[PDB]
Amino acid sequence: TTYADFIASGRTGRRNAIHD
Amino acid sequence: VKEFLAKAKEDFLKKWENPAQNTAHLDQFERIKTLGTGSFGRVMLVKHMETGNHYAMKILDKQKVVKLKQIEHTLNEKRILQAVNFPFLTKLEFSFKDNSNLYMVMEYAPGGEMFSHLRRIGRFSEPHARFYAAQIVLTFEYLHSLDLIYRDLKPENLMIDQQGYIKVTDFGFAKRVKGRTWTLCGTPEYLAPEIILSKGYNKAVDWWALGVLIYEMAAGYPPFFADQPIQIYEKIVSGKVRFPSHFSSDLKDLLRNLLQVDLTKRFGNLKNGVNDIKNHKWFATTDWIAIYQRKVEAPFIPKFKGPGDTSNFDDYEEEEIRVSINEKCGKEFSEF
Ligand SMILES: CNCc1ccc(-c2ncnc3[nH]cnc23)cc1
C-alpha cells in the first residue's frame, strides 16, 4: 500500500527546508 | 473582504515602513524549554517575568545566519512579522538582538505542531482537513494582498492553539515582492514545479503548496514522496498524482485545480483569485466569516493541563544561549 511505502520511507519525520 | 483588506494594508504599511526595533531584552525572560530546533535556529518557550505571560522565542545565531546566506531572508522575516496582524499568524510581540543572537518573541501555541498530531493519528477526516485548510486560505488571502509570499507551507510550521485553531509560523522564506522572484527555497515535498524548473515565480507557489497540504492532511502522506529529494522533484514535474479511493469527488477536484502545473488554470492564480477556492464545492459548508471570527467549533482540541504546558511538543536537547563579549555581524543586522 501507499501508506506502507510512506511509513517505510526515510521522510516521515520533520522535513527540513532546502539549502543551496 | 475588500474593505477589511484595504484597512489591513494601511495598518501593515505603517509598520512595514517604520519597523519596531529593540523592544525587549533577554534578561526580561525566563527560558523554559526548547520547542524546536534546526537550520531555522531554535524556538523556545519562555516566560515574560514582568507579566508572567508565556511566549515562543525564536533564537537565531547571527554567525550561523551569515554562513547559511540567510541574512536578507532573516531581515525579511522580522520586518514582515512585526508588521502583520492576523488571527492565524504569529506576529512579533517583541524583538531584539545582542552580541551573538537575534530574538523574535511571538504568541505561544500550546497545542503542538500539526505535524505531530497528523503523523500520530495517521490522517485527518475531510471536515477536519477543511477546518485547517480554511484558515490557510484566509491567511494567504491576507498575506498575498500585502504582496507577501510565504514559501514554506507544511504541517511542521502549523501550530495548534488552545482553541484548536492554527497559527502559521516560521517566516524565514517569506518575502514582500510585487513582481516575480527566483530564489530556490522551500521544502522538497511542497515545491511548485516552476520553482524546481528554476523559473521566475509568484504567489501561485503558495496555492500549489496548499494543494500538497490538503492532500497530506486528508491522505496521511504527501502526493509526491520518495527517499531522496531528486526523486521527489521527478514526481512533481512529471504531471501526475494519484488520490486515495477514500478522497471525495469534490476533494479530488479541488486538488486537481491546486496541484495544477499550468499557471493559467491553477486555482488562486486565475482572474477570480481566491474566490475560485472559497466558492469551490469542497468548501460549501465553510462559513468563512465564522472561521475568521473563531466561532466555529474545532474538530480537535488539544489537552489543556496548563498555561506553559509543553506535553504536546517533542523533547529536544537543551543548548546554552551563549552571548559573546564581542559584537558579531553588527553591520549585517543593523536594521534588525
Ligand atoms: C519545525 N517546528 C519548530 C517549531 C515548533 C514550535 C513552534 C512554536 N510553538 C508554539 N508557539 C509558537 N509561536 C511561534 N512559534 C511557535 C515554532 C517552531
Using the Cβ of A19 and the Cβ atoms of chain B, whether some distance falls under 8 Å is answered with yes
d(CA B163, CA B312): 14
The β-bridge partners of B60 are B102
Q: Where are the domains of chain B?
A: 1-18+113-303, 19-112+304-334
Residue of B nearest to A6 (CA): B221
Determine contact, residues B210/B258, Cβ cutoff 8 Å.
yes
Question: Collapsing DSSP states into helix, strand and coil, what is residue B158?
Answer: strand
DSSP state of B130: H
CATH label, B19-112+304-334, candidates 3.60.15.10, 2.30.29.30, 3.30.56.10, 3.30.200.20: 3.30.200.20
Give the resolution in Å.
2.0
Burial of B262 (0-12, 13-18, 19+ CB in 10 A): exposed
Cα-atom radius of gyration of chain B, to the nearest Å?
20
Nearest to A18 by CA among B41, B217, B189, B231: B189
d(CA B116, CA B138): 23
CA distances from B5 to B82, B174, B273, B294, B313 (A): 18, 19, 14, 18, 34
CATH superfamily of this structure's domain B1-18+113-303: Transferase(Phosphotransferase) domain 1 (1.10.510.10)
Could you tell me the three cell numbers for B23? 523592544
CA distances from B327 to B39, B117, B208, B248, B312 (A): 22, 41, 42, 57, 36
Nearest to A10 by CA among B120, B187, B154, B229: B229
Question: Collapsing DSSP states into helix, strand and coil, what is residue B215?
Answer: helix
Ligand 1 atom with the smallest distance to the CA of B37 is 3
Which of A11, A14, A19 faces B115 most closely, judged by CB atoms?
A: A14
The beta strands (E) that lie in B62-213 are given as: 92-97, 101-107, 148-149, 158-160, 166-168, 175-176
Which of A2, A9, A16 faces B38 most closely, judged by CB atoms?
A: A16
Question: Collapsing DSSP states into helix, strand and coil, what is residue B61?
Answer: strand
Determine contact, residues B195/B98, Cβ cutoff 8 Å.
no
B129 CB-side CA count, 13 A: 26
Method used experimentally: X-ray
Nearest to B277 by CA among B218, B209, B196: B209
B152: annotated active-site residue:
yes
Yes or no, beta carbons of B189 and A18 under 8 Å apart: no
Burial of B218 (0-12, 13-18, 19+ CB in 10 A): buried
d(CA B71, CA B119): 33
